[PDB]
C-alpha cells in the first residue's frame, strides 16, 4: 500500500534476513550508513539472532520499538508440557511465567542501547497490557519509568522525544557528576571515609 515507498526518502531500512550472511552484510551497510550519517532502520525478532548479543551505541543505540508483548507461540505442546511441568514441581504459574519470560526477552532486546554513563535514548513500548509489568521490569529500567508514562499516546510521546533531544542536544557541567556518578580515586577514598 506504499507507506514504505513514501518513507523511503527519509532513511534506509534493513530487515533480519533468513541468511545470517546477508544479515551481516546488512549490518555492515547499516554501520556505514550511520558512519556517513544516512542511517537505517532495523527489524528483527525478540527471539531472533540479533536479539542475542548484538550491541548498538550512541548512534546505533538511539531508540528501539517493541510492538506488543513478545510471546512465544501459544499452541506449542512442548511449551504447554513445560508449563504444566514447572507448575507441578516448583508451583510456577503459567500465565505469570509467560508474561515474565516475554518481559525477559523484551528487556534483553531493550538493553542493547546503553553502554556507559554517556549514551542516551528514548525507550518506546507499544501495548495496552504493558502497564501492569513494572514488577516484571528490571529495577533500573522501571526506575526511570514514570507512573504518568504508564499510559501515554503517540502525540505526547513525540513531544517528550522532542524535548529529550533538545535537552541532550546541549552540554552539561562536569561538576554535577564529578563525584556522585563518576568518581575519582579521591572521591572513592572520600566515600570510603564516609562509610567508615
Amino acid at each position: 500500500m506504499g507507506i514504505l515507498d513514501e518513507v523511503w526518502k527519509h532513511k534506509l531500512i534493513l530487515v533480519e534476513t533468513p541468511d545470517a550472511q546477508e544479515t551481516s552484510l546488512a549490518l555492515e551497510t547499516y554501520r556505514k550508513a550511520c558512519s556517513n550519517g544516512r542511517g537505517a532502520i532495523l527489524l528483527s525478532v525478540a527471539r531472533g539472532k540479533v536479539s542475542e548479543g548484538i550491541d548498538f551505541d550512541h548512534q546505533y543505540g538511539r531508540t528501539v520499538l517493541m510492538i506488543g508483548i513478545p510471546f512465544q507461540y501459544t499452541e506449542s505442546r512442548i511449551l504447554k508440557a513445560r508449563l504444566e511441568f514447572m507448575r507441578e514441581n516448583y508451583r510456577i504459574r503459567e500465565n505469570d511465567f509467560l508474561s515474565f519470560d516475554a518481559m525477559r526477552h523484551a528487556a534483553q532486546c531493550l538493553g542493547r542501547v546503553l553502554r556507559g554513563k554517556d549514551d542516551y535514548g528514548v525507550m518506546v513500548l507499544a501495548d495496552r497490557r504493558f502497564s501492569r509489568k513494572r514488577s516484571q521490569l528490571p529495577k533500573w529500567i522501571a526506575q526511570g519509568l514514570s507512573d504518568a508514562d504508564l499510559n501515554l499516546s503517540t502525540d505526547m510521546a513525540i513531544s517528550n522525544t522532542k524535548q529529550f533531544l533538545r535537552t541532550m542536544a546541549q552540554p552539561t557541567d562536569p561538576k554535577d557528576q564529578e563525584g556522585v556518578s563518576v568518581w575519582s580515586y579521591e572521591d572513592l577514598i572520600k566515600h570510603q571515609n564516609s562509610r567508615k
Binding site: 558512519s35 550519517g37 550512541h58 548512534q59 533531544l165 533538545r166 542536544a169
Partner: peptide, 9 residues
C-alpha cells in the same frame, strides 16, 4: 533539529 553523527564527525 538535533545532533547528527556525520556533522559531529
Amino acid at each position: 533539529s538535533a545532533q547528527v553523527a556525520i556533522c559531529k564527525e
